[PDB]
Design a protein around this ligand. Structure first.
Ligand SMILES: O=C1C[C@]2(CCOc3ccc(Cl)cc32)C(=O)N1c1cncc2ccccc12
Ligand SMILES: O=C1C[C@]2(CCOc3ccc(Cl)cc32)C(=O)N1c1cncc2ccccc12
Lengths: 296, 300
């Protein structure tokens, strides 16, 4: 029993974290094989990069200084070629994720991991992380079997305290740019499929008070969802929730009528999994993984 | 900016997780140097659930009855001893991945990271607090016995918890790494119940300071209170008493924000009386008590 916000074990990623220093700027780099990936704002772009030499980049892996033998830029990420392949390079891939998908963040300062937490790509393409100055270059990842899928690299903080970054190919998530200028996160919405997955996790853990005898049409639920700033629920989402629906005996549209009552009436002093709000940072896959004990 | 429930990076602990098998029983072990630590109930059978005599069961065991697996490698057990509720299996190989470490017994209210494992393989990491009733509200399934709780402070891993069992309410009980249980629990299937739980007051106040540091001030008020008057109120909401030690511990956050501890205590009294009124504090509609004053300073 129990349901916690749970991150993937960070060991495979800790072995890849290095410190990158260029001029007065120090941030984190991801060392995979003979390449160090980090945000291109460390040079502070084609004109600034051409003026740099390999020795201007100081890369430190532990107390060992790596020697940079090449440098190139791919979108908003800088790739520093090094003389040594990282012996701790795990099996990995670079994946771009969609809003609603969750991942673990290994927060680092000066190439040293300090914390790990779980979070979700918000529908407005921001992440509600926890980062201070020096965290740039920290990475978001998932683990599939023995393979690390890198999905995020941290670049900046928006005026509202939320965070913006890119995939490992340097493409930003959302309408953001990597410069000090006026940029605002769009109005956020709740990840509906994740709330439903979390209501199934609550039922699996013995919490049933919110269940009702009612069901709804997908169209009628989507009208209610639009009204409460909830993301639309698609037939794909309904299909994805199928295994949890089969395990608990509560059909997806039946759980939707429970969600619809919760949105119109509230919790009435009650909690679900120790929370008084509807939690939306657990995907259907996260719920199945935690309620079945999948290992890495 | 931002405030999240944050665990320590688990790499140093992952390289210590092994699988320990005794007969039909399989759980997790912690391999540090040439010793594997694990819950002593790995030696129990179905008939020995209610009232096991561990000294008697252990004397009947030989080194080759313990199967220890680190990855696809089987380690050879060359000795075995019991310290309270933990079994210590001496092995013929020192773990090359042994970090700098120490064993610490923690107090209620203290937080730590849990590396949940099944069959010697880590599956997830999360942050926990030792409840005032000495239980933890973890996320554990069958096979999680031996999973450990730890903190990391500058390269050194302090091991503070080893998972042993789940109580009827879904909460969890375990020991320090010396095998001493936290709370009035025993490693037997006899009827056991967690005492009524209370809110960790000092942790809620630390979290209200984290909210002020992050820009939220709506819950603040012009009032202050006496320490005694706060305690008379707080205990009516099942909150732990706030001691002068707790007031002293909150001093640095009080200095950083300009809000005296007894002034923040008056904000807390008002939040208890009024509720949140549709508002949230650090994205939560409840008062969060699993962040210590030390965690708040570390993260902010
Ligand atoms: O370290 C940096 C560089 C900066 C600030 C300067 O202006 C720029 C311009 C471009 C870019 Cl890509 C990043 C930045 C930024 O947001 N951060 C941080 C990143 N995450 C959290 C933070 C919290 C507190 C202060 C800073 C933070
Ligand atoms: O694996 C075990 C052994 C057991 C089961 C029998 O009763 C006892 C009695 C004493 C001792 Cl020390 C251990 C146990 C136990 O609680 N667990 C669990 C431990 N954490 C979570 C769990 C979830 C679901 C089922 C079991 C769980």
């Amino acid at each position: 029993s129990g349901f916690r916000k749970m991150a993937f074990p960070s060991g495979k990623v800790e072995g890849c974290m290095v410190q990158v220093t260029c001029g007065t700027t120090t941030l984190n780099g991801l060392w995979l094989d003979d390449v160090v990936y980090c945000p291109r704002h460390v040079i502070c772009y084609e004109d600034l990069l051409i003026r740099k030499s390999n020795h201007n980049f100081l890369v430190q892996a532990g107390n060992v200084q790596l020697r940079v033998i090449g440098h190139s830029m791919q979108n908003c990420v800088l790739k520093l070629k090094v003389d040594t392949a990282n012996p701790k390079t795990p099996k990995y891939k670079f994946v771009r994720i969609q809003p609603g998908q969750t991942f673990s963040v290994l927060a680092c300062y000066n190439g040293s991991p300090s914390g790990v937490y779980q979070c979700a790509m918000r529908p407005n393409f921001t992440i509600k992380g926890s980062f201070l100055n020096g965290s740039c270059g920290s990475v978001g990842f998932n683990i599939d079997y023995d393979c690390v899928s890198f999905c995020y690299m941290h670049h900046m903080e928006l005026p509202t305290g939320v965070h913006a970054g890119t995939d490992l190919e340097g493409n930003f998530y959302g309408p953001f740019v990597d410069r000090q200028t006026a940029q605002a996160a769009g109005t956020d919405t709740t990840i509906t499929v994740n709330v439903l997955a979390w209501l199934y996790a609550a039922v699996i853990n013995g919490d049933r008070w919110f269940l009702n005898r009612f069901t709804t049409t997908l169209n009628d639920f989507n009208l209610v969802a639009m009204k409460y700033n909830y993301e639309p629920l698609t037939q794909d989402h309904v299909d994805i929730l199928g295994p949890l629906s089969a395990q608990t005996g509560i059909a997806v549209l039946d759980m939707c009528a429970s969600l619809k009552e919760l949105l119109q009436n509230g919790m009435n002093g009650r909690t679900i999994l120790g929370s008084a709000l509807l939690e939306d940072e657990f995907t259907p896959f996260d719920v199945v993984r935690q309620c079945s004990g999948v290992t890495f």
